[PDB]
Amino acid sequence: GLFGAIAGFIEGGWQGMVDGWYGYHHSNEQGSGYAADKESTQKAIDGVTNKVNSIIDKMNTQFEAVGREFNNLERRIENLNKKMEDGFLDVWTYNAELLVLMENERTLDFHDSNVKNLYDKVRLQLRDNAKELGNGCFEFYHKCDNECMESVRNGTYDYPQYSGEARLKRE
């Protein structure tokens, strides 16, 4: 919610988009179908997988909780051992619980920032040739074929060719 894209900016995710995590509702006279950004999703999946794997990797070394026996006259040492046992389990439980809580923010912020990043990437390429709306959708001033849809996805939008068309249409 820090970057304010996934939660509040765009009302909700698309239920019919099953490939990847971040996609493009390309609407055109040829067809109104969904899509997905392979490059953005893959690095998002790579980052999440790296985060969880590194979390597990750094958590393989903790306290082993070895049990010991003490007689009736060694209650002080037994309590000395018992409190260490609980003390090490308490901090490791605190470390595990807190790490999940903080990383949950980062994972959701990472997902929140990504949609904001893909939001900006399309906006910076399209510039004035597209009318930006309250939702994540961009209403193109100029009609274009599926070539322009995939050009936006590929990151190789041809601005000067469509700049004149938008200027002529706008009055």
Binding site: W21, V52, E69, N71, A96, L101, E103, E105, G136
Partner: protein
């Protein structure tokens, strides 16, 4: 004619925890906590564990007449016994450094019981009469199998001069003990010596014991006590025993042939004819999760223990 941006949305109900917002629904989440177990005792890497059927570690080592199924045991992965074993020191007494011995036994996977001192090495004492009803067998007076209670023979008790080489290549665990009588007449009626002693001498051990002839209270019907002692005899090291009476002479020692890692586990679960990498007093973790919350004490390939009821790491986006 318009492009748009959104994210993946599914119909799942996975929930994650965030310090500023509880109960957050996400599209995809990964559970990192294991909360399930088979619920039965299960083999560790294909090695059958040593299961003491209501018997204690000291009773097994000393040869409890009831615990006679452990006369010869194979290699084990860990030792499991009940929290309060009924068969434990049938004759009232104590085992010195019992907790230290259990710690030492936690890293031994096999014993090769050998007859270091045969029963034919006592031609001037009495091996037959050392029987109690605190240690009964098939309802007959009997006594611990691995040690010998020596009684006076022909109204005499000559001083014991016993020495033993550790010619083996492995450490030998030797168990002996001392018997504390009740009164002076009992002492002379069973040992013939009023003032007795037990001196044990090794390279590192110099011990002298004197019985405490006092008045105690009936435990298992007996007001007498027997304190048992143990030592680890190194290879090429000799052990010497000199006693005037009250001697529970060793008969069987234990070779430490395999010395790996193990635990002594307290659980009342039954065997299940199973095969697991990590064991638990409650059950066995058949998973490769980062964390688990079954029991802190775990042997084998074990995930980390935490005291949290749930641990879910968010992977996908918010489900909305």
């Amino acid at each position: 004619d318009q492009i748009c941006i959104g994210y993946h949305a599914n119909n799942s109900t996975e929930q994650v925890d965030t310090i500023m917002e509880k109960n957050v629904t996400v599209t995809h989440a990964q559970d990192i906590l294991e909360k399930t177990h088979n619920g039965k005792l299960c083999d560790l890497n294909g090695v059958k564990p040593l299961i003491l059927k209501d018997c204690s570690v000291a009773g097994w080592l000393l040869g409890n007449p009831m615990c006679d199924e452990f006369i010869r045991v194979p290699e084990w992965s860990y030792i499991v016994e009940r929290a309060n074993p009924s068969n434990d020191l049938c004759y009232p007494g104590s085992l010195n450094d019992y907790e230290e011995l259990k710690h030492l036994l936690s890293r031994i996977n096999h014993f090769e019981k050998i007859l270091i001192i045969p029963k034919s090495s006592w031609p001037n004492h009495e091996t037959s009469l050392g029987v109690s009803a605190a240690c009964p067998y098939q309802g007959a007076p009997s006594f611990f199998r691995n040690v010998v209670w020596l009684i006076k023979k022909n109204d005499a008790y000559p001083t014991i001069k016993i020495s033993y080489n550790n010619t083996n290549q492995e450490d030998l665990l030797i168990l002996w003990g001392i018997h504390h009588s009740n009164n002076a007449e009992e002492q002379t009626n069973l040992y013939k010596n009023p003032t007795t002693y037990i001196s044990v001498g090794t390279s590192t051990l110099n011990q002298r014991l004197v019985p405490k002839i006092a008045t105690r209270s009936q435990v298992n019907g007996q007001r007498g006590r027997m304190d048992f002692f143990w030592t680890i005899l190194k290879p090429d090291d000799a052990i010497h025993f000199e006693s005037n009476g009250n001697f529970i002479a060793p008969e069987y020692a234990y070779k430490i042939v395999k010395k790996g890692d193990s635990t002594i586990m307290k659980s009342g679960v039954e065997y299940g004819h199973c095969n697991t990498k990590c064991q638990t007093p409650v059950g066995a973790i058949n998973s490769s999760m980062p964390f688990h919350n079954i029991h802190p004490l775990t042997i084998g390939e074990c995930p980390k223990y935490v005291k949290s009821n749930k641990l879910v790491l968010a992977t996908g986006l918010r489900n909305s």
